[PDB]
Amino acid sequence: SFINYSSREINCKIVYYGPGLCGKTTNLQYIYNKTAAETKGKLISLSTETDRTLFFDFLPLSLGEIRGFKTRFHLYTVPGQVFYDASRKLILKGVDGVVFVADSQIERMEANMESLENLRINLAEQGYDLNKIPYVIQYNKRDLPNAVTVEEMRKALNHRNIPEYQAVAPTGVGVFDTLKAVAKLVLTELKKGGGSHHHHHH
Ligand SMILES: Nc1nc2c(ncn2[C@@H]2O[C@H](COP(=O)(O)OP(=O)(O)O)[C@@H](O)[C@H]2O)c(=O)[nH]1
């Protein structure tokens, strides 16, 4: 988190991760369109010649303060086909919570498994353990006839009873349930004072 004492805001970074075309943009856009205009920034896309980043922030009005501070959530993803692994490494810098979005189609199951391993390795390369940070998994595209059962999704992707949410992102099914779950894990960590605290005088 980035705790800005001037604004009295705790800024938490939630990264949506998963294979290309699995539904990350759709999650972010659905959330963005169902967030109060007065609470949110612009929806921002940063494009290079190849890879892109999509993100926005918002300050939910329902949330109480944590020891005098409000919590602002920043949602980040690298959407679409990824050309540089470095892009997925960079998106994880400063992460506070992760949503892994799995594409439930059988044809994408190997891509899901590769992306989940890539997430664990890229986190570890920057000193994060996926087992020690707020993390939820979304089984997206439940509407498609080639979507594998939750049982098969879990056998392939979830061996630690990670909180799991079924989603159909374009219609919003499961989208807020997923976000609420990871946000609650992040907030619980903040309230208990868990994690490593660094004091900067910049
Ligand atoms: N049928 C179906 N299509 C989906 C679902 N979620 C995303 N899509 C479609 O899959 C494509 C890729 O989604 P997108 O969110 O851009 O993927 P990203 O690369 O992970 O950001 C788009 O055409 C979406 O409309 C879903 O739950 N069901």
Numbering used by the authors: 2 to 203
List passages from the publication reporting this PDB structure:
The localization of motility complexes, and thereby the direction of movement, is determined by an oscillatory system, which includes Mutual gliding motility A (MglA), a small Ras-like GTPase, and Mutual gliding motility B (MglB), its GTPase activating protein (GAP) as major components. In this study, we report the biochemical and structural characterization of M. xanthus MglA and MglB (MxMglA and MxMglB). Thus, MxMglB plays a dual role in increasing the GTPase activity of MxMglA by orienting the catalytic residues (role of a GAP) and by facilitating exchange of GDP with GTP (role of a GEF). Allosteric binding of the C-terminal helix (Ct-helix) of MxMglB on MxMglA facilitates nucleotide exchange.
Structure of MxMglA is similar to TtMglA with 2 additional β-strands (β0 and β2*), compared with the 5 α-helices and 6 β-strands present in the small Ras-like GTPase fold. All the residues of the small Ras-like GTPase fold as well as the C-terminal hexahistidine tag were modeled in the MxMglA structure. Though GDP was not added during protein purification or crystallization, the crystal structure of MxMglA contained GDP in the nucleotide-binding pocket. High-performance liquid chromatography (HPLC) analysis of the protein sample reconfirmed that the bound ligand is GDP. The purified MxMglA contained GDP bound to the active site pocket.
